[PDB]
Amino acid sequence: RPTVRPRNDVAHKQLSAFGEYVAEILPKYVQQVQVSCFNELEICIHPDGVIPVLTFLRDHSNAQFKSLADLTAVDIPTRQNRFEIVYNLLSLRFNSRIRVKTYTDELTPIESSVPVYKAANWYEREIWDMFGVFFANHPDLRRILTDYGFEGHPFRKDFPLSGYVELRYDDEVKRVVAEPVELAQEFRKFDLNSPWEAFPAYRQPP
Amino acid sequence: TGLVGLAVCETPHERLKILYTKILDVLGHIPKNAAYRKYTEQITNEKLSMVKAEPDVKKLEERLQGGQIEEVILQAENELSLARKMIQWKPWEPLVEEPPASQWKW
Amino acid sequence: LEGIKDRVLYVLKLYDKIDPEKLSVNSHFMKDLGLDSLDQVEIIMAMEDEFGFEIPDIDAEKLMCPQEIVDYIAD
Amino acid sequence: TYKYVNLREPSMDMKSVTDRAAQTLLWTELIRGLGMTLSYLFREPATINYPFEKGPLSPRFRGEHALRRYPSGEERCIACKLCEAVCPAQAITIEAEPRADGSRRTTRYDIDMTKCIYCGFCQEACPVDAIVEGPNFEFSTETHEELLYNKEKLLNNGDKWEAEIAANIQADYLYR
Amino acid sequence: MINILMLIIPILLAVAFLTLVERKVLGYMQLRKGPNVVGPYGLLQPIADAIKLFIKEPLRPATSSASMFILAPIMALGLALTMWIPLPMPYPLINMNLGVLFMLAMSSLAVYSILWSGWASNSKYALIGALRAVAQTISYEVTLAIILLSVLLMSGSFTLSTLITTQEQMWLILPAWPLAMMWFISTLAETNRAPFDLGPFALFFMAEYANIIMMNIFTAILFLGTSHNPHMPELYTINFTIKSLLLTMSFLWIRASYPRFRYDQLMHLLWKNFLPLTLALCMWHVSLPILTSGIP
Amino acid sequence: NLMLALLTNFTLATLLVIIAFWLPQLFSMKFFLVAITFLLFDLEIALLLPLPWASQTANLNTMLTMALFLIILLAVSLAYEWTQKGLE
Amino acid sequence: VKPIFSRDMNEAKRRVRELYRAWYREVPNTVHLFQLDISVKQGRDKVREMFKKNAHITDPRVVDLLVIKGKMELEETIKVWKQRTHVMRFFHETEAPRPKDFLSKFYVGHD
Amino acid sequence: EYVVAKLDDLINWARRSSLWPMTFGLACCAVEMMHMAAPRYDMDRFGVVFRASPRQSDVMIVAGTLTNKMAPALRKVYDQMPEPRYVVSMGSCANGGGYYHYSYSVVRGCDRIVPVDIYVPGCPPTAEALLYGILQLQKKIKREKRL
Ligand SMILES: NC(=O)c1ccc[n+]([C@@H]2O[C@H](COP(=O)([O-])OP(=O)(O)OC[C@H]3O[C@@H](n4cnc5c(N)ncnc54)[C@H](OP(=O)(O)O)[C@@H]3O)[C@@H](O)[C@H]2O)c1
Ligand code: SF4
Ligand code: SF4
Ligand code: SF4
Numbered sequence A: 001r002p003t004v005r006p007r008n009d010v011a012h013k014q015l016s017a018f019g020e021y022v023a024e025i026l027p028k029y030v031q032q033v034q035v036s037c038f039n040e041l042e043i044c045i046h047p048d049g050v051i052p053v054l055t056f057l058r059d060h061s062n063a064q065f066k067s068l069a070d071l072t073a074v075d076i077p078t079r080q081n082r083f084e085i086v087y088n089l090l091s092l093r094f095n096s097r098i099r100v101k102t103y104t105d106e107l108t109p110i111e112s113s114v115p116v117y118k119a120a121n122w123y124e125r126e127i128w129d130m131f132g133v134f135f136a137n138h139p140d141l142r143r144i145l146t147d148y149g150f151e152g153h154p155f156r157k158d159f160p161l162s163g164y165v166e167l168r169y170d171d172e173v174k175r176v177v178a179e180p181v182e183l184a185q186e187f188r189k190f191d192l193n194s195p196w197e198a199f200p201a202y203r204q205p206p
Numbered sequence B: 001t002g003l004v005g006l007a008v009c010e011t012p013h014e015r016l017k018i019l020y021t022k023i024l025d026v027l028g029h030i031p032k033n034a035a036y037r038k039y040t041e042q043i044t045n046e047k048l049s050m051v052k053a054e055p056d057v058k059k060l061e062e063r064l065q066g067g068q069i070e071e072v073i074l075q076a077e078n079e080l081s082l083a084r085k086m087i088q089w090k091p092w093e094p095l096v097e098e099p100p101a102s103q104w105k106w
Numbered sequence C: 001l002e003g004i005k006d007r008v009l010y011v012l013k014l015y016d017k018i019d020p021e022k023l024s025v026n027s028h029f030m031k032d033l034g035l036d037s038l039d040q041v042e043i044i045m046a047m048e049d050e051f052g053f054e055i056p057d058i059d060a061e062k063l064m065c066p067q068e069i070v071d072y073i074a075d
Numbered sequence D: 001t002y003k004y005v006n007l008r009e010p011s012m013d014m015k016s017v018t019d020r021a022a023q024t025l026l027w028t029e030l031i032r033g034l035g036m037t038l039s040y041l042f043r044e045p046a047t048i049n050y051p052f053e054k055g056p057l058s059p060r061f062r063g064e065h066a067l068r069r070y071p072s073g074e075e076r077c078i079a080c081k082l083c084e085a086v087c088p089a090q091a092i093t094i095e096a097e098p099r100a101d102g103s104r105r106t107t108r109y110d111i112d113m114t115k116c117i118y119c120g121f122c123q124e125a126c127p128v129d130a131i132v133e134g135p136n137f138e139f140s141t142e143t144h145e146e147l148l149y150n151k152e153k154l155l156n157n158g159d160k161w162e163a164e165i166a167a168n169i170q171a172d173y174l175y176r
Numbered sequence E: 001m002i003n004i005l006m007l008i009i010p011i012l013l014a015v016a017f018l019t020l021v022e023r024k025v026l027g028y029m030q031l032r033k034g035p036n037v038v039g040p041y042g043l044l045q046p047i048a049d050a051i052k053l054f055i056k057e058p059l060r061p062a063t064s065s066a067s068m069f070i071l072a073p074i075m076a077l078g079l080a081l082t083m084w085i086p087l088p089m090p091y092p093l094i095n096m097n098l099g100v101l102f103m104l105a106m107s108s109l110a111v112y113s114i115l116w117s118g119w120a121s122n123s124k125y126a127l128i129g130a131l132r133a134v135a136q137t138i139s140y141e142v143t144l145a146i147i148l149l150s151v152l153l154m155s156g157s158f159t160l161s162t163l164i165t166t167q168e169q170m171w172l173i174l175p176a177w178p179l180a181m182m183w184f185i186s187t188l189a190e191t192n193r194a195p196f197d198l199g200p201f202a203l204f205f206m207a208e209y210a211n212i213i214m215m216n217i218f219t220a221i222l223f224l225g226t227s228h229n230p231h232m233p234e235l236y237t238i239n240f241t242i243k244s245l246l247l248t249m250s251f252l253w254i255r256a257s258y259p260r261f262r263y264d265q266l267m268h269l270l271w272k273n274f275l276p277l278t279l280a281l282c283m284w285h286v287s288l289p290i291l292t293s294g295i296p
Numbered sequence F: 001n002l003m004l005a006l007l008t009n010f011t012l013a014t015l016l017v018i019i020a021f022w023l024p025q026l027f028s029m030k031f032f033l034v035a036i037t038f039l040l041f042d043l044e045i046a047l048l049l050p051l052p053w054a055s056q057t058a059n060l061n062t063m064l065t066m067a068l069f070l071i072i073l074l075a076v077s078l079a080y081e082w083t084q085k086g087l088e
Numbered sequence G: 001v002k003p004i005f006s007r008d009m010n011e012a013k014r015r016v017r018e019l020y021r022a023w024y025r026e027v028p029n030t031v032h033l034f035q036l037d038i039s040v041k042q043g044r045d046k047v048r049e050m051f052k053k054n055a056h057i058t059d060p061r062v063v064d065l066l067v068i069k070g071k072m073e074l075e076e077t078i079k080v081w082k083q084r085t086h087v088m089r090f091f092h093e094t095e096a097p098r099p100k101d102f103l104s105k106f107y108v109g110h111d
Numbered sequence H: 001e002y003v004v005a006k007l008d009d010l011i012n013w014a015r016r017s018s019l020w021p022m023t024f025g026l027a028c029c030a031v032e033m034m035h036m037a038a039p040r041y042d043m044d045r046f047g048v049v050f051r052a053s054p055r056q057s058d059v060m061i062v063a064g065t066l067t068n069k070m071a072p073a074l075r076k077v078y079d080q081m082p083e084p085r086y087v088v089s090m091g092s093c094a095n096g097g098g099y100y101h102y103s104y105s106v107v108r109g110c111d112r113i114v115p116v117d118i119y120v121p122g123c124p125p126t127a128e129a130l131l132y133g134i135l136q137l138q139k140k141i142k143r144e145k146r147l
Helices: A012-021 A051-055 A120-130 B015-027 B036-052 B058-062 B068-077 B079-088 C005-014 C039-051 C059-060 C066-073 D013-024 D029-044 D082-086 D121-125 D156-171 E009-016 E016-029 E043-057 E073-081 E100-108 E114-118 E122-138 E141-155 E178-189 E200-222 E233-257 E265-267 E274-291 F002-022 F031-048 F060-079 G011-023 G027-033 G038-054 G060-070 H002-017 H028-031 H072-082 H092-096 H127-140
Strands: A033-036 A043-045 A067-075 A083-090 A096-102 D092-095 D108-111 H059-061 H086-090 H118-122
Touching: A012 A043, A033 G038, A067 B036, A067 B079, A083 D121, B015 B068, B015 G027, B015 H002, B036 B058, B058 B068, B068 B079, B068 C059, C005 C066, C005 D013, C039 C066, C039 E200, C039 G011, C059 C066, C059 E114, C059 G011, D082 D092, D092 E100, D121 H072, E009 E016, E009 E200, E016 E043, E016 E233, E043 F002, E043 H002, E073 E100, E073 E114, E073 E200, E073 F002, E100 E141, E114 E122, E114 E200, E114 E233, E122 E141, E122 E265, E141 E178, E141 E274, E141 F031, E178 E200, E178 E233, E178 E274, E200 E233, E200 F002, E274 F060, F031 F060, G011 G027, G011 G038, G011 G060, G027 G038, H002 H127, H028 H086, H028 H127, H092 H118, H118 H127
Parallel strands: A043 A096, H059 H086, H086 H118
Antiparallel strands: A033 A043, A067 A083, A083 A096, D092 D108
């Protein structure tokens, strides 16, 4: 292969050492599942303790991460437990990227990452906005990307793309901008999904 | 001479030696059977030998840091806070928490 | 306390969604008068502003009758 | 890589201190900054007045949509719904019916200008090269109704730009 | 007495025809073309702005408090136009007993124009920014009085006609070298929008740009002169206009070239730094007529 | 006439307001310390105003010591403005 | 227990009571500070109809989340936030509004 | 009779001479609106002045995307404007939501908030095409108030 392959695996075995090192501590409180693919590491964490996992990787003699920078969340209705809050972490001294995930349904409150990371509070507001996941012991939980008179949570797959309150008229009332009107133009639902399985090995037995 | 960061580059030796000797005792208070104490100690003992051998050389600062003594002192300063938090909240010593539901593949 | 029952009855009878003559003295606001779980306690909040005393959440649950409310008002 | 932004004390003793003090006592560098705009005033400005002069362009530029046709009559659009699905704005709508007898080429063909973020994706996805993006700027309306394009018609009225399109596509086959 | 109308009507045209200069000369500084479509070189645009704002443009006041808001432009335009009267020129209209004292007085009363506008709006949102704009003008008037006196104490009384006669061979820029630098900066404080910036709204433009020409002329009396010539009024009239026009270019130079100094650090340039400098030169200018004979 | 010259400017200024009016038909106390110091300095300027017009007949040696004296104390008042003025 | 939320069963009910008092005091204040709009009395009637739709109470987990949301959408007035009589308005102004009947809805023909 | 018809054009010439637009930085369109200042394509002091100001301006350009958060915000700006007001919806987002459209937050059409007189269709609305929007505005002003 010359153009077909992106990069050959060489650091994959080196990154697999981290998949053993953190797992050598072996907590049922923390570890659970460790996944490593395409020069990247992924860890999912039990809901009971998220803060003790985040205090780890911060400082530490073997690996120095410090920056718990970017913070995402996954909406998926397949599992019994719905949401999956995903932390993307980066090291400056070590130069590596590791991932921290949560497995809980988190309609019930989850522990905040504000005491460990300063910029985490702004991302925590977005998760409460789009997904509707409350963070316990959080300072200033305020709406950012949502409207001031917005109902529900705008991202959830349970409701449509257009929404319920979206169209804003002016018409009859001199100053009051309208809200209750719900109709919008037709978004064409594409049913484009290819027959036959796309890739081998990814197939799971029923 | 001053470091680029906000932390002031102060000419202080053995300051790194005090903090690294302090954290070893804290680890030997509550966890003993846990692997957290068994693995962190051998890295710290390896680093302490480099300080004792090299007298105020930039090569000693270049070992596993390479951003002068000011960056290495910050690594020791938060080490005591990380060890005390690990001693207070039991996670390394005890493992008994419930397992997740069987689903992972997307 | 003297002249406390007269001050509380004048504000309670004047308020909306309440009987002026049917419910007076000893009768409960939630049991005898006929009010909702949030509606009955809301009338007690209006009486607190007129008297000039702030009422806690713990003491508000026990009080329902105007006769019982007069004893709680004294400080 | 390191480059360093800090000067680290430009003044040391006597000679180096006085000139650093002279620029703060009076001005000097402000008068030197005055000279920058002074020469900038004399040099000729690059300005284009639109109703007479025109700005620079390219052989491939996307503006207002217009569908092309074959040299011997016949509408080049074959009706696929290909360009419909690629369209990221969903501006293009297509419903097709058989044309009289034999031929099957279009009936409904509306492209919204209220939508459309201009990609050239519909130009790329088209196997017959029907929608070719012509050098267009002039489009201004009173209503949305006048702005959004109807069932071909106004798109077919792009004949006034199709002479330029035929010249531009000659720089497009075997790309540049 | 017809000459008063011959000093308002051509002056109102000068403020109008500034709109060409204020964005064409400023235009070539920024490599952009200014007025071109409207006229042959855009000469029709300055008068076109008057037809736009005066006649057709209607009013929407915030509260309109009886007398105010419709009184503030009268104070703005009135004080700006009355400043033209004491001006020496080749020959002054109704020459005052003391010249420069009338000049400093009507400029200090011109602070009211931005004061009554702050009282016109009922909201607290506008008046805080309005008082900040007063602070830009009120502070620099302290130094403006000092630098004036140092020029006067060198030669001549308060009369503006005597200031032309004292500049016979050499300009006053050379003896007052640091003081001439001050008049380039101190004049820009009076709503010029170069070191600091904050119907009837259009009338404020006609008054604020009028003061810009006024400070350009007043600097060309205190520091410029070249020649007097009482027998030939022709030679003085042309030579005075060119000197004033060169200072008008420098006023538009600061507006384009240099960013705002901040309101807090405007009080660090002045008061903290300029006031010790101006008074030290004022101390120097007291000793000058005593050290060497220099009394009018 | 000064009275005729002044009134002509104001009457034309009032007329410009009516054109736009009639024709168409369809907190923080730190600012105060700056304002007070303006007044107190200008009064020292008022005492130092006569200098170019006064010094013509009077003796120079008697004036020299007194003329500088007002400016010195005007700098001492600014010297008190250096011992913590504020954030302004 | 799991999961905590904020309160356990009976304690969650009294958190709504504390929330009710804070919002009842703001509706007279949001007439002079904000705008007249409709009425002070009619604004208080808008409060009671809002809590009637929320009145179910089966688990403290659902109740606790309503308190946090109740200290946000009703908080959009206390600390002074921009709305300009467009945001935080709950009642429909231009509503038809439709009725539920087999004679009223069927005459208009819907669904 | 003849003077009445000619004087009306003179008032219309005043707006044909100069138009002061509002500088709304609410878009990628706003960067192309900054290309109107860029010397190569200029209406600057040809008609356009970048001073803007909420009250003194005659024209307001609604640049691109508008959300439900900005829907009450842009409406109160329009009320502050003087009676001779023209609104240009420069960009495909302003015309009816170029992208997004079917999204929850983005307001469709802009005319649901503020009425539009001149529409500009272009996403990256090329400065060449942007020059039409002002030139068409000047051409559209023909006759005002007959009686
Ligand atoms: N509150 C009340 O005053 C009151 C009380 C009781 C009943 N009403 C009823 O309600 C209605 C109120 O309407 P309104 O007075 O509000 O309307 P309006 O303001 O007078 O508006 C009518 C418009 O139609 C145009 N128009 C009408 N007749 C025209 C003609 N012959 N030629 C050209 N243009 C013409 C006018 O345009 P131009 O200006 O360009 O000509 C005007 O702009 C009345 O018809 C009245 O019967 C009112
Ligand atoms: S434009 Fe091209 S791709 Fe689209 S329907 Fe016509 S022929 Fe097919
Ligand atoms: S240019 Fe892009 S958005 Fe426009 S019609 Fe073509 S594919 Fe759709
Ligand atoms: S029309 Fe295009 S350039 Fe303009 S705001 Fe929308 S996406 Fe950005």
